[PDB]
Amino acid sequence: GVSGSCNIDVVCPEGNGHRDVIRSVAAYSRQGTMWCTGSLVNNSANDKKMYFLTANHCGMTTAAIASSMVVYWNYQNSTCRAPGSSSSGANGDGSLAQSQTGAVVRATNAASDFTLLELNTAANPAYNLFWAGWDRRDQNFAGATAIHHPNVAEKRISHSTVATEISGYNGATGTSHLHVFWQASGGVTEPGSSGSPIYSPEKRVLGQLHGGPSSCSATGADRSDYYGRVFTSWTGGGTSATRLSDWLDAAGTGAQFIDGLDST
Amino acid sequence: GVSGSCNIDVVCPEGNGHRDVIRSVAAYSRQGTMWCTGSLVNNSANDKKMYFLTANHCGMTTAAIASSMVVYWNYQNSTCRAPGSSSSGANGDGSLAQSQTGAVVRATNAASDFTLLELNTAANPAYNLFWAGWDRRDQNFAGATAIHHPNVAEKRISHSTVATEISGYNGATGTSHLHVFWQASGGVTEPGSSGSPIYSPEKRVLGQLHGGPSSCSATGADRSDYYGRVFTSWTGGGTSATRLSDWLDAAGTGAQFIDGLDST
Ligand SMILES: *C[C@@](*)(O)[C@H](CCCCN)NS(=O)(=O)c1ccc(C)cc1
Ligand SMILES: *C[C@@](*)(O)[C@H](CCCCN)NS(=O)(=O)c1ccc(C)cc1
Ligand SMILES: [Cl-]
Missing domain, CATH: 2.40.10.10 (Trypsin-like serine proteases)
Structure with missing residues (x-):
């Protein structure tokens, strides 16, 4: 399949800490x-x-x-x-x-x-x-990892190395979603990635992808996505x-x- | 109720051409x-x-x-x-x-x-x-009007005076949605507005609000929304x-x- 070039094939070194949950x-x-x-x-x-x-x-x-x-x-x-x-x-x-x-x-x-x-x-x-394991506690994490099929193409990995935030979808008032911020030149998610997990640093599912502004061309705060929370x-x-x-x-x-x- | 100040109360003169479909x-x-x-x-x-x-x-x-x-x-x-x-x-x-x-x-x-x-x-x-009437033809229009309850608050009207576009949700490849662009300082839509109609210039429903980047502070291409199409x-x-x-x-x-x- 075909997806945005900024994405990261799971077999890359970026997957070295996730060889178990990749298989989920x-x-x-x-x-x-x-x-x-x-x-x-x-x-x-x-x-x-x-x-x-x-x-x-x-x-x-x-x-x-x-x-x-x-x-x-x-x-x-x-x-x-x-x-x-x-x-x-x-x-x-x-x-x-x-x-x-x-x-x-x-x-x-x-x-x-x-x-x-x-x-x-x-x-x-x-x-x-x-x-995969899961974590339903009501909290943010210091980073997170997505494993997903953008455009329903070959599996990719995207890392976040900053804190998550809790909000409603698209930044609205609420607590149903985890807002995850991608790296400035790292992997993102695309249509077809929906339903993919977001993992805590301990490799536990925190939610699944709903949507958001990210794409390979997105910059700043647009390079982010929202996950419906397991907590919710x-x-x-x-x-x-x-x-x-x-x-x-x-x-x-x-x-x-x-x-x-x-x-x- | 409470919603963004840039919105336009339906009783305003901006509603003078929509006194029928306001009541829908x-x-x-x-x-x-x-x-x-x-x-x-x-x-x-x-x-x-x-x-x-x-x-x-x-x-x-x-x-x-x-x-x-x-x-x-x-x-x-x-x-x-x-x-x-x-x-x-x-x-x-x-x-x-x-x-x-x-x-x-x-x-x-x-x-x-x-x-x-x-x-x-x-x-x-x-x-x-x-x-309200409806129009299921496969086409864009030169402008459109939204009537909606942003934040599920009092009813508002938002006008678009540029052409609609057809796409998938959030600008993805596809034809399921009508992309409607708001006026630089006109009304927009907000969470709670979902499900509200978008009307053609002839006051026929073309779709209902899914979501999009607009808010009172949004600018340019972000000051827009996507409607799931009646055609679709x-x-x-x-x-x-x-x-x-x-x-x-x-x-x-x-x-x-x-x-x-x-x-x-
Ligand atoms: C359904 C999912 O594949 C997408 C993921 C988009 C990720 C962008 N960074 N979600 S969505 O928001 O595009 C969406 C939501 C609802 C519907 C009906 C289609 C697409
Ligand atoms: C559900 C709707 O009220 C909103 C409208 C947002 C308009 C912004 N200009 N849609 S949404 O995209 O915020 C949304 C989509 C899915 C879910 C579960 C919640 C909110
Ligand atoms: Cl949605």
């Missing part, structure tokens, strides 16, 4: 068309359920639509294309051969733009998946079909954050 | 909290069905939520507060006494951020409603529950555009 992230199609990003999340039972977090605006919100989604694992460029180069802006060499079809919708809610699916097919050990989605719309808590902590352990789980 | 627009609450804008739309049978167009991201997509929504008609400042003045930025004197409760969802679709509700209660003649929503997700056509032209007249219908 997937691209998917909707009604056959490459559409959005999501990622696999662990739950407090550490049971490998195929919980797959994405964005509500991607429209994976009915049983009918979820039934025919196709999830593509391990779609990334085989080599590190220099960020900012014509190569990085070119069609990559990723494979779309490792896939699975079908899901059900466990919860969805507009306010924090989240959808939690559960994929129908158990993880194929051969795909070498990872279920945890309680969501106050019902099991509109929140994360029933799914990610079904046994009521009281966990405020958990670590990931490998397929190994 | 309402503010509404969601689980009791003032939340978003929507508006009444005519259909090809001219029958006063309470079709009420709003934005999908406002989250009025389930029977439970739609059943408890409250719609507030004729909420506007009684006098024209000078745009840009401290008065315009102050709490207004609108009334929230003319209301009705409850709706059902007729159609919704994420890609053009639309929801078509049908309100449960037939129009009270005393509220003096108007059902007409066919929507390809089923009656995901598109406008079955509802706004149930009669199968083949109309490409219709005019409005007054309570009289």
Whole structure:
């Protein structure tokens, strides 16, 4: 696929601290068309359920639509294309051969733009998946990392090395979103990156991409994005079909954050 | 309510050409909290069905939520507060006494951020409603007018006197949205304005507000917004529950555009 050249292929050295959670992230199609990003999340039972977090605006919100989604694992460029180069802006060499079809919708809610699916097919050990941890505490972090499929193309990584902020979407009054500021010449996110995770420094999901002003040409405060918060989605719309808590902590352990789980 | 001072109270002379479609627009609450804008739309049978167009991201997509929504008609400042003045930025004197409760969802679709509700209660003649026309043709216009409740506060009007453009949301590749550019010191839209109509110069709904960079301090290309298009929503997700056509032209007249219908 094709995305902005300033983005950073996950196989680049910039991915060296994220070789586990890289394997959580997937691209998917909707009604056959490459559409959005999501990622696999662990739950407090550490049971490998195929919980797959994405964005509500991607429209994976009915049983009918979820039934025919196709999830593509391990779609990334085989080599590190220099960020900012014509190569990085070119069609990559990723494979779309490792896939699975079908899901059900466990919860969805507009306010924090989240959808939690559960994929129908158990993880194929051969795909070498990872279920990422999460952190639902009400706080900002000193930096964060995005792993995403911009334009639903090969997987990329984008780092933030400044504090997050809490606000409503697009800077409005509110607390539903984490505002993440990209590096002046670093990776960003693009349409199709929606639903991709943002990870704390401890590699725990804090939210999933809603949208924002960033692009490779964006400067200043425009080089940033908003993530619907796990903190907010945890309680969501106050019902099991509109929140994360029933799914990610079904046994009521009281966990405020958990670590990931490998397929190994 | 309180909204940005650059906005223009509908009773101002700027509303002199829109005294009909002003009466289409309402503010509404969601689980009791003032939340978003929507508006009444005519259909090809001219029958006063309470079709009420709003934005999908406002989250009025389930029977439970739609059943408890409250719609507030004729909420506007009684006098024209000078745009840009401290008065315009102050709490207004609108009334929230003319209301009705409850709706059902007729159609919704994420890609053009639309929801078509049908309100449960037939129009009270005393509220003096108007059902606006619509135009589903695939084209730009030379200007456009927004009527909306920014911050879900008193009703405002914003005029665009330059051409619209067609794009995806936030300027992405696509054709799902109408991009409307506000006047350098004119009215804009704000969170809470979502779901409000944009009208052609002929006063026909062309779409409903999704979002965008505008605010009273925005300049240039940022002083603009994106509306999910009626053109796009007409066919929507390809089923009656995901598109406008079955509802706004149930009669199968083949109309490409219709005019409005007054309570009289
Ligand atoms: C849906 C997502 O892929 C995008 C991500 C944009 C990231 C830009 N830096 N979100 S969005 O805001 O463009 C969007 C929101 C709603 C709809 C219906 C489409 C696109
Ligand atoms: C929901 C709407 O009230 C706003 C309108 C913003 C207008 C700015 N000029 N849309 S939004 O983009 O701020 C938005 C989109 C999705 C969600 C969940 C919240 C807000
Ligand atoms: Cl949105």
